[PDB]
Amino acid sequence: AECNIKVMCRFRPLNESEVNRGDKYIAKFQGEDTVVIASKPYAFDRVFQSSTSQEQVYNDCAKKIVKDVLEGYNGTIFAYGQTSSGKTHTMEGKLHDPEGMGIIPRIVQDIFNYIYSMDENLEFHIKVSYFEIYLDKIRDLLDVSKTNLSVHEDKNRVPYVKGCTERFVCSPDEVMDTIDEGKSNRHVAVTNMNEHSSRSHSIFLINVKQENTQTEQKLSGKLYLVDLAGSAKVSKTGAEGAVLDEAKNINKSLSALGNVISALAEGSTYVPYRDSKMTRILQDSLGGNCRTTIVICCSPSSYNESETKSTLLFGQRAKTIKNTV
Amino acid sequence: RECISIHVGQAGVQIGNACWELYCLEHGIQPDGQMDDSFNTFFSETGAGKHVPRAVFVDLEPTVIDEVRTGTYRQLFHPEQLITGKEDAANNYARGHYTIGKEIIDLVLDRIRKLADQCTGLQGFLVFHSFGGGTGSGFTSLLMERLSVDYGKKSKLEFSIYPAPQVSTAVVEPYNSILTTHTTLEHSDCAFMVDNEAIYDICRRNLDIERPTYTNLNRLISQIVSSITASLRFDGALNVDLTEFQTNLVPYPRIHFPLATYAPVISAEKAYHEQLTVAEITNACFEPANQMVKCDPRHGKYMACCLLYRGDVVPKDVNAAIATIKTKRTIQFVDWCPTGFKVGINYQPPTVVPGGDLAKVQRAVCMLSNTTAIAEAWARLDHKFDLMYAKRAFVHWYVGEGMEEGEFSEAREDMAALEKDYEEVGA
Amino acid sequence: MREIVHIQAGQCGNQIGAKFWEVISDEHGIDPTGSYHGDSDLQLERINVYYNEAAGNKYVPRAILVDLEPGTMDSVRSGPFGQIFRPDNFVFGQSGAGNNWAKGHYTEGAELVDSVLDVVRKESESCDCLQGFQLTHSLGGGTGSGMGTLLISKIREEYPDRIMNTFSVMPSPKVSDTVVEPYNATLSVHQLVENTDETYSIDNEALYDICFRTLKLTTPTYGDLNHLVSATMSGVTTCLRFPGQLNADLRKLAVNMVPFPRLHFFMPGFAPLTSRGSQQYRALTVPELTQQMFDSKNMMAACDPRHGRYLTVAAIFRGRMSMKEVDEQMLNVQNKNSSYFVEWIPNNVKTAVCDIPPRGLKMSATFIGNSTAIQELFKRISEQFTAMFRRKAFLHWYTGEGMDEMEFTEAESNMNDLVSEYQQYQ
Amino acid sequence: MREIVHIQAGQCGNQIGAKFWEVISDEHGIDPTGSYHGDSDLQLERINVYYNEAAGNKYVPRAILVDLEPGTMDSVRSGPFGQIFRPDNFVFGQSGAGNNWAKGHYTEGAELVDSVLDVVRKESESCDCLQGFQLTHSLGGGTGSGMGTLLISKIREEYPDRIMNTFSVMPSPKVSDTVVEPYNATLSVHQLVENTDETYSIDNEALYDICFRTLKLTTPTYGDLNHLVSATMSGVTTCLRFPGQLNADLRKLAVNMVPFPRLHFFMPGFAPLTSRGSQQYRALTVPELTQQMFDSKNMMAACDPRHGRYLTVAAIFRGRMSMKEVDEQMLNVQNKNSSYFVEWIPNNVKTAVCDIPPRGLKMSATFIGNSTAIQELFKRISEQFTAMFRRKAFLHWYTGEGMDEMEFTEAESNMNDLVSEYQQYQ
Ligand SMILES: Nc1nc2c(ncn2[C@@H]2O[C@H](COP(=O)(O)CP(=O)(O)OP(=O)(O)O)[C@@H](O)[C@H]2O)c(=O)[nH]1
Ligand SMILES: Nc1nc2c(ncn2[C@@H]2O[C@H](COP(=O)(O)CP(=O)(O)OP(=O)(O)O)[C@@H](O)[C@H]2O)c(=O)[nH]1
Ligand SMILES: Nc1nc2c(ncn2[C@@H]2O[C@H](COP(=O)(O)OP(=O)(O)OP(=O)(O)O)[C@@H](O)[C@H]2O)c(=O)[nH]1
Ligand SMILES: Nc1ncnc2c1ncn2[C@@H]1O[C@H](COP(=O)(O)OP(=O)(O)OP(=O)(O)O)[C@@H](O)[C@H]1O
């Protein structure tokens, strides 16, 4: 009936831009649940170390959600963190490598692998969609003609996306082809802090509807796999020109997420999901029937101490939130 | 010896047009731009029988530059020095810094660079602005950081207008004040402050102006800022340089926030009935109600003080005056600096504006006092900020500019560290 | 410098917009023909912020009058100042909306929006630097609510960085001259809350209440009501039109008055508002007009502010005055009414002043108010919308233009979101 | 400085209040239009204590005229000085009380008191420092006794620290122009004794007796009676309007004249009161007018003071005079009438003097008297109240507005408490 939003932290190794500057490794781990930064605790469910590989993260965090989303409930996996925190490497990664592949290929592989183990009477109809935010407009990457989509409500007043490129898929390899088309059309800019700086909050939706021929029971599940951008410090990154305009929109999304997640932690009356459109599509995740699992990303460098501490308290105030499942 | 003075924002240029009229009247410079070594530190020699100030009035909104161009001081100021922007700051620290700030700083930073090449005796800098809004917070803070990396060693005298506890003009002022002070704490060698409600108290009980305006407020500001540089313009018995305000007032490189107050302030009919000697002005400048900033010095302790006089002021009597201030146990100096006095004398008397509210006097004093009394003011400014920060009030504008919740917390903990130092030094 | 592109949609929007150009033309000293005859040089200094230089020292206004009927333009063009507007800006259709939000938003507006978007584009490119858009429309009817809201969304995507000013009159239960007013009101606010960064919520019955009690006019017509709301439009745009001791641009008002992005529905006001016979028996000083501004009578909305609390209020003063009296008066109004101001903000009263007052008055001030009492006007529109929607009353005309009932339910959910948001900060 | 807010309730209160503003306007030298034309500078020095500065050197009075009928204001507004008052202060209902205390206190006043309390609030906040309230009402009728007493209780809770002046005329058995006068009188004094700190008990028959014997006028109308009672109002407020050798504020009179909180019902007077033909045959010196002040004829109440004893009396002199003659005259009046002064107080005669006498007279003085003889007027009202109440006569009209007979019994108990209190100190 009620389940807490599970939060997990993932630190990474030092990148090339950090070791040459001489940044000190501040991450100090005390077991799996507790992490200490500058002699103060931060309690979570599972804290991943820098040596944790790609497959080890998926087995611990998003393994059980494949069973929960197919049982009849909804599920959402989205990450929070600043630039160079390791978000795109976690979700997207590199698809052509079996070891370096992230969560969203592993999610698709486990869904199709579980369907092959089920009996023939369970008929599945998977249909995918993929879009991002750019210049304050919902742009679909599977079709470059349309640049703005509207967010409409369903019969139960739950918001969802209308007009998205809804591709019906049969095999898992076709889903990997669309993910290749998704990353190719993604507007990724360059900056001083991250060469592959994704300047958009990319949303991957899989509306997994199923129906058994024997029992004649229909079930549906909305599986949002979001890859959010990060609040880039203009003094550190040097966002000038058109990328400065991108900093406005991406920071509005996470600052709006900061409002609703703090409103839910304190337990306000209104819970302003209508602050931004990114909060609307994430409305079911934080206050719907979804088994949400936030995965906060942080860097261990001393150059980013202030923003990393803000990411941990972002997770601690997420720990006290419960969904209406 | 020379110096340049820039102005930023509505508060800066309204001080600039109000103070430069006083500077041109002292040296006999007519408003049309013309009439030896006294006016050299502020005004240059423009060929033959003509002068120009070494100043630049910069503001993002064009409401204030056009009236100075079409005012009465059209020929005095250089027309190219009057820089005007394109878009308003809108009381946003982020908007006047990054969006509108980045496209205009390249003009003014290179302008003051070549404006220093013709100069040779540049002692330092003094700026005029206000952190109560956007232009004086965003564009000023970007100017200070980009000037400190270029020059660095030269001094910078900040004159900001802070808000009162209850009286105010804006509503989102502590966000602009707390964000810009994170950068101003390390780049400023010294920073004098003024309040908006205290200066009304100066003209109410003493000058008896029941209906004052910002024109009257800036005229006594001109007396303050012109008195600190009066030693450089004219000879005196004990001259003090502009760099004296760095050594004799800053005990530590991050504690550089002194107060300000000035005396005598007296109307016309009261000037002839009141006696004017060094005793009462020395008793009046330490008076807590006669201060330019709302802080009770009785609660705190003075770290350093400097007295600079003007006019016919002999040295034997002023040394007796400060001796009476030390034995007075109403105020109390800190044990870390028993010799907390710096005396200065100048023969040139205080001038008056034609038709001005202030009366003529044979002598005056300008009291800049370093103390820990601003700690309770900062804690009150931080206290009101915590109520709005908890509800995320007025946050969607700043994050819409490009910033985020990071520097909000960095400004908070940095202000907390400022409070931690003022309570440690006051022990 | 900071040009503002004016736009007039709907019958009432063209009327109040026509009065807006009339009242400011007297402030700047412009003849009805278009020539300058002002007495001061400051009137001509910031004349380009609305007008454009033309041959013979003529000044044309940037007013784009749009309406789905032709007869409305004939009354505006045949007015006293109707001859100053540009003939190219008079773009209009033939078939009216007939008080239908769906017609002006899907069928009648879609065929006309392609023509008017070319008119605002050339006007916005000819300016030196665009500041914002000043809209005049009405939530009642079809052309004001349907087409007037639609063009803002096209302007929003085209100019996302520029502000959007909307002076939007809205109905009331006591004065209701339209049967299908709550449907047009409930659907319009769904589009206004996402697009417009600024919205002046004006009520008609308050303007009737203002003219009856404080003005006590014998025969108030619609033209007298336009004089009140037109003065508020001229008062907000005073700082970027004349010099002042504390200037506040329209963006500066937005940063101070919009604490959250959805809380941009304010309660405007204007003062002094005195009768012809009660002028000699009144002093023009600043403290007496200040308490009139914060009074429930002077405000141009039916919501009593004492039923709620002010989020943040702005008072744009005008005329030569004492700054101490302005700074001390804003203190005492919030001190002795601390229950009616939020405790989680230390100072809620924004202020500004100008040197050039209106013609015929020595001192004046305009009140803009953000308060939780405005939700009372939304819920009465909501229960009127819910009362007619729960049995699908008067919906079949909307469905003829391809509109679905889900959008009515979505507008109802947004209407529930508005009243709950203002209740959070109360 | 020490502003006094004037208030006029009821028909008689508006008439005597209208004469009060007329007689003092001549002392200060104010035209009927509102402009100043006085000869001395001291007239303008303390003009702000009642009036307010306005444009064109105009001075508006702070007179809040309240009445439950509209025709009363038409006679006051159409008077000689009716054009000086503010139109906003003229607040009034439509349905009269019809000489019923219950209507003006529960139904007709309750709907109007919310409107008038907003008028006195803005006038009290605009002043520099509020001193007190000067009320003019009548115990007869419904609008004077019912509504006029009710507004004081609302002002009492709002301003508990400020004094309350009430010049209240009350009926008499010999001159009775109302059938339901004792019910209105008995109910009103119950509210006056707890709220008002000051009460000038004036009787109508004494004003008829004063005009008949000492003045011997041929045809005294109501306007001539108003001239007597209006002069006493101007006499008490002389010290805070002009300089004087011994100033006595209205609060200074209260501390001297109110020995106990309930004993604040006094017997006013005025002198010199001479005919036109008997002016040449009289000296204006101080000893001859002093004995006229302590005479039973000059006092404006029907109670003969020789039937009781003075608690404490005040004589506010006016004009240039010898202080020794004032100090020696106050001694001999109490010496040779020691039986008529209480032995448990060593000196009962308060005194004050001013330098600027009234216009047309060189010297004058006003008598205020606290004595035990005032209880005679209360018991005759009591036995009239008890005579009609013991068989429930004329009560069913009062019960229609929700009033109970217990409040009549409570007012009867307070009436018994008043007469017993003055008998204690006799
Ligand atoms: N204060 C004013 N209010 C007006 C005026 N004219 C109309 N209205 C009010 O606004 C309400 C609706 O506004 P409109 O008259 O513009 C209806 P609209 O033209 O938008 O649609 P259609 O005429 O059907 O094409 C209307 O019912 C009035 O209450 C006016 O001149 N002044
Ligand atoms: N000395 C004066 N006495 C007056 C005057 N007018 C009335 N009165 C006396 O006061 C008595 C009652 O006072 P009012 O006339 O004011 C009756 P009121 O207006 O309060 O009630 P309603 O008229 O029934 O609404 C009345 O019976 C007279 O004896 C006057 O002008 N001068
Ligand atoms: N003492 C004093 N203060 C002033 C004067 N002029 C402006 N100020 C202060 O300046 C503050 C506003 O700061 P600014 O950033 O300059 O405001 P602005 O220039 O209008 O900026 P925008 O609103 O964004 O256009 C106000 O709160 C005033 O208290 C002045 O002449 N004297
Ligand atoms: N756990 C990890 N181990 C090793 N390398 C990592 C890890 N996480 C991230 N990286 C490195 O980071 C790079 C990718 O950076 P990434 O795109 O994640 O930046 P980002 O923070 O997502 O940018 P944005 O905030 O714009 O989305 C890869 O080249 C990868 O080598």
Residue numbers in the entry:
A (entry chain Y): 5 to 329
B (entry chain I): 2 to 36, 52 to 443
C (entry chain Q), D (entry chain P): 1 to 426
Paper excerpt:
Microtubules are cytoskeletal filaments that play various important roles in cellular processes, including intracellular transport, cell division, and establishment of cell polarity. They are highly dynamic tubular polymers assembled from α/β-tubulin heterodimers, which are arranged in a head-to-tail manner to form protofilaments, with ~13 protofilaments associating laterally to form a hollow polar tube. In vertebrates, both α- and β-tubulins have multiple isotypes encoded by different genes, which are intrinsic factors in regulating microtubule functions. The GTP bound to β-tubulin at the E-site (exchangeable) is hydrolysed within the microtubule assembly proceeding via longitudinal contacts with α-tubulin, while the GTP bound to α-tubulin at the N-site (non-exchangeable) plays a structural role and is never hydrolysed. We determined the cryo-EM maps of α1A/β2A, α1C/β2A, and α4A/β2A microtubules in the dominantly populated 14-protofilament type at the resolution range of 4.2 Å to 4.4 Å.
Recently, we reported that α1A/β2A and α1C/β2A form microtubules displaying distinct properties, which was mainly mediated by the C-terminal tail of α-tubulin. Previous studies have suggested that some tubulin isotypes have a distinct influence on the dynamic properties of microtubules; for instance, microtubules composed of α1B/(β1+β4B) possess a faster growth rate and lower catastrophe frequency, α/β3 microtubules display a higher catastrophe frequency than α/β2B microtubules, and α1C/β2A microtubules exhibit a faster growth rate and higher catastrophe frequency than α1A/β2A microtubules. To investigate the architectures of α1A/β2A, α1C/β2A, and α4A/β2A microtubules and explore the impact of α-tubulin isotypes on the structural features of the microtubules, we characterized the structures of the three kinds of microtubules in the presence of GMPCPP by using cryo-EM. By superimposing the global Cα of α-tubulin on the left side, we found that for α1C/β2A microtubules, the lateral interaction between α-α and β-β contacts in the non-seam region was similar to that of α1A/β2A contacts, with the Cα atom root mean square deviation (RMSD) lower than 1 Å. Additionally, we did not observe obvious structural deviation in the lateral interfaces of these three types of microtubules. We first superimposed three consecutive tubulin dimers within a single protofilament of α1A/β2A and α1C/β2A microtubules by aligning the Cα of the bottom α-tubulin together. We found that the longitudinal interactions between the intradimer and interdimer of α1A/β2A and α1C/β2A microtubules are very similar, which was confirmed by Cα atom RMSD analysis. In the present study, we assembled α1A/β2A and α1C/β2A microtubules, determined their cryo-EM structures, and found that they displayed similar structural features. However, the tubulin C-terminal tails that extend from the microtubule surface were unresolved, most likely due to their flexibility.
